[PDB]
């Protein structure tokens, strides 16, 4: 076997915004999770339903890596059972979610004098995601009794909403590059272990 | 350029229907973006806003409490054109009608214009 | 209803502000203010929309504002080409005008 692509995840130059969420397959490798437990670097390391330590000695038919960027602040939300814009509207996870959130401040990287507005977050849904659930839609959201009939305007908006990220702003308002792992066991022969 | 051609001026007799057509070419009476509207002016009464006909998916008529209970605005897909008509009319009716675009942004922010486009007016004088 | 001064006089080069008054259901309801100019016997133009936005080829002469119940004109520079009827508009479903404000300059 051969070892599992973190860099590609973690190391990533650009990350993808909340709403529109990456996912990364990881199969058929060997990987080590102890140095980042120990890697002097993220700000938040929450683990679900798994330990923070020798989680090294285990194994899972496919591992999946899912990164995006929000607000120090939302990071709390990247839990089960939890509630907020980005819980309900950009990103769900499942109450018997198993795996890990690994989150690290990028302002450096992804905040910029005027605002950095590639990130965006959905400010507007008619209802709650599903946990794993990925909406891209672009439709005109209809916040007043009438109609939009998909023309953007007053009491019509669109549901998108730009972070704007910049350095001056306080550390809950800085971006903050966040990877979930989850850990999938299936009724069929395993993929992914390494000690 | 977008114009509105109006209905030639004439005599209403009283208590019959005033009856006006507006041409639009340059736009079209169904747009989504805009309303069609009658204006009328006196010079002791000034600008008398009458009413609107919109067409949002479905058709739709706002009119002006003092003429609710007399007044119709009729567009026409057919023709591209809208048309106004005031019952029973008096002395009270002359005045100079005007059909107006009321005309709303539908592009990155929304603007409301208001009537940015006006017919060239057509006088009503009612008279026996 | 909505209150206009009926007559406002001005020299050229002078500046000019014409009050348009109402109610809080009718100018202070929204912004959606609009004014127009009115030569004699041809159709009114919109000069100003939303208050303060001057629709494309209109001079920076005009200008507008709204505070309270209380939207505004201001013309500056006043040339003679400027005599004529100015009313403000305002929407809220129905559409109000005020009641007009004939605009001389003195020669």
């Known amino acids: 076997t051969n070892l599992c692509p973190f860099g590609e995840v973690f190391n990533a130059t650009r990350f993808a915004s909340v709403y529109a969420w990456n996912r990364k397959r990881i199969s058929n490798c060997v990987a080590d999770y102890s140095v980042l437990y120990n890697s002097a670097s993220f700000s938040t390391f929450k683990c679900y339903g798994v330990s923070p330590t020798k989680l090294n000695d285990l194994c899972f038919t496919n591992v999946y890596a899912d990164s995006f960027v929000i607000r120090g602040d939302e990071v709390r939300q990247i839990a089960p059972g939890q509630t907020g814009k980005i819980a309900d509207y950009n990103y769900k996870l499942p109450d018997d979610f198993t795996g890990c959130v690994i989150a690290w401040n990028s302002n450096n990287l992804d905040s910029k004098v005027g605002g950095n507005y590639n990130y965006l977050y959905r400010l507007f849904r008619k209802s709650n995601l599903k946990p794993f659930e990925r909406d891209i839609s672009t439709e005109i959201y209809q916040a007043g009794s009438t109609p939009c009939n998909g023309v953007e305007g007053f009491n019509c908006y669109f549901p998108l909403q730009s972070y704007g990220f910049q350095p001056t702003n306080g550390v809950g308002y800085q971006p903050y590059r966040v990877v979930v792992l989850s850990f999938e066991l299936l009724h069929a022969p395993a993929t992914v272990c390494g000690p | 350029e977008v114009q509105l051609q109006q209905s030639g001026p004439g005599l209403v007799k009283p208590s019959q229907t005033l009856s006006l057509t507006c041409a639009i070419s340059g736009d079209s009476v169904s747009s989504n973006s805009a309303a069609w509207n009658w204006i009328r002016q006196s010079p002791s009464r000034g600008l008398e806003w009458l009413g609107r006909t919109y067409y949002r998916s479905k058709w739709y008529n706002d009119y002006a409490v003092s003429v609710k209970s007399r007044i119709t605005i009729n567009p026409d897909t057919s023709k591209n054109q809208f048309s106004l008509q005031l019952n029973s009319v008096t002395p009270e009716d002359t005045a100079v009608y005007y059909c107006?675009?009321?005309?709303?942004?539908?592009?990155?922010?929304?603007?409301?214009?208001?009537?940015?486009?006006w017919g060239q007016g057509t006088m009503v004088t009612v008279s026996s | 209803v909505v209150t206009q001064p009926a007559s406002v006089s001005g020299s050229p080069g002078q500046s000019i502000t014409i009050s348009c008054t109402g109610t809080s259901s009718d100018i202070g309801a929204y912004n959606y203010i609009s004014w127009y100019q009115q030569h004699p016997g041809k159709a009114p133009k919109l000069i100003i929309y939303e208050v303060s936005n001057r629709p494309s080829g209109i001079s920076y002469r005009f200008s507008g504002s709204k505070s309270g119940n209380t939207a505004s004109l201001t013309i500056s520079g006043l040339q003679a080409e400027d005599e004529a009827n100015y009313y403000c508009?305002?929407?809220?479903?129905?559409?109000?005008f005020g009641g007009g404000t004939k605009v001389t300059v003195l020669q």
């Open positions: 107006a675009r009321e005309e709303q942004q539908l592009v990155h922010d929304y603007y409301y214009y208001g009537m940015d486009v």
């Open positions: 508009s305002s929407y809220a479903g129905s559409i109000s």
